[PDB]
Amino acid sequence: EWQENKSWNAHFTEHKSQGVVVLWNENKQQGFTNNLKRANQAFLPASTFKIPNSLIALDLGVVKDEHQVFKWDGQTRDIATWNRDHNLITAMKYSVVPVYQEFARQIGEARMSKMLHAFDYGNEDISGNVDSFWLDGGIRISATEQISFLRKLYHNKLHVSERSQRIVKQAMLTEANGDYIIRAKTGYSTRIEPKIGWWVGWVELDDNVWFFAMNMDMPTSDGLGLRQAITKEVLKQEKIIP
Ligand SMILES: O=C(O)c1cccc(-c2cccc(O)c2)c1
Ligand SMILES: [Cl-]
């Protein structure tokens, strides 16, 4: 069911880093990773939490649809793309934390906790501030747990409406061409050690789907581009994409 190939560690060590990639072949029901231990180590989800947060906001009516405009609050932040109006699509694309902090406040502690339990999401623990627990609170999730959650979303099996799941999968759209479609979300966790970057999602092919979840050490922001580049290089090496 699960295969470990330690030779794949080279994808990370060649960049003076360390990390884990987890792949799941949906047709064959088989998983692959460079490091079984780290595949099951739980980290802060950081901005990968925008996937469940979006689902909950939509299903409760906090967010009406993917066109609703969330107005900039006029506070200048250090990320230029955050200092503008957003909808669900662009808020996901630019990982706009302050928009999702407001989602969480309107959702509230009680409904957030119940929905994460219903999703079987990570350790299901929202301890901390309701508007920041995915950045510096008690919630934790592993790469293998991310895949389990993403598989439910793909199949519309999460305990929210089909509509809510379709909208979030639209907002996850990252890349598409004649050969494949990638739906995914990045994450960048800095407030609790160890600092890591995430990329989780899946690759749609004509006749199969490959789920993936990766995290890697991220001592500075200079390496953030490695999250997608390394993942895509693994996918190419395993002949999942050209
Ligand atoms: O990697 C990203 O998609 C992303 C999107 C928005 C903000 C950031 C970010 C947040 C904090 C420090 C930093 O250098 C970059 C990263
Ligand atoms: Cl789409």
CA distance 171 to 165: 10
CA distance 135 to 90: 20
CA distance 226 to 228: 6
> Which ligand ends up closest to the CA of 223?
1
1-242 falls under which CATH superfamily? Answer: DD-peptidase/beta-lactamase superfamily (3.40.710.10)
CA distance 220 to 53: 26
The strand pair at 2-4 and 30-33 is best described as parallel
Q: Nearest-CA neighbor of 148 among 239, 233, 47, 39?
A: 39
Q: Nearest-CA neighbor of 24 among 140, 116, 141, 148?
A: 148
Concerning whether 127 is annotated as a catalytic residue, the answer is no
CA distance 234 to 34: 10
The secondary structure of residue 195, as a DSSP letter, is P
Determination technique used = X-ray
Range 16-50 burial, b when 16+ CB lie within 10 A, else e = ebbbbbbbbebeeeebbbbbeebbeeebbbbbbbb
The secondary structure of residue 9, as a DSSP letter, is G
Q: Nearest-CA neighbor of 227 among 101, 138, 123, 95?
A: 95
Range 53-77 burial, b when 16+ CB lie within 10 A, else e = bbbbbbbbebbeebeeebebeeeee
33 sits in which H/E element: strand 30-33
* Resolution value in angstroms: 1.8
103-110: Cβ within 8 A, 24+ apart: 103/53, 103/54, 103/56, 103/57, 103/62, 103/63, 104/53, 104/130, 104/131, 105/130, 105/131, 106/57, 106/62, 107/53, 107/56, 107/57, 107/60, 107/62
Ligand 1 atom closest to Cα of 186? Answer: 3
CA distance 165 to 131: 22
Tokens of 196: 């890591």
CA distance 182 to 201: 7
152 is in an annotated binding site: no
CA distance 135 to 142: 15
- Site residues for ligand 1, CB cut-off 6 Å: 79, 94-95, 186, 188, 221, 224
Give the orientation angle of helix 50-60 with respect to helix 143-154, to 10 degrees: 40
**What's the chain's length in residues?**
242
Longest dimension (CA), the chain: 51
The strand pair at 181-189 and 173-176 is best described as antiparallel
CA distance 46 to 207: 32
CA distance 32 to 8: 10
Residue 49 near residue 147, CB atoms below 8 Å: no
CA distance 12 to 228: 12
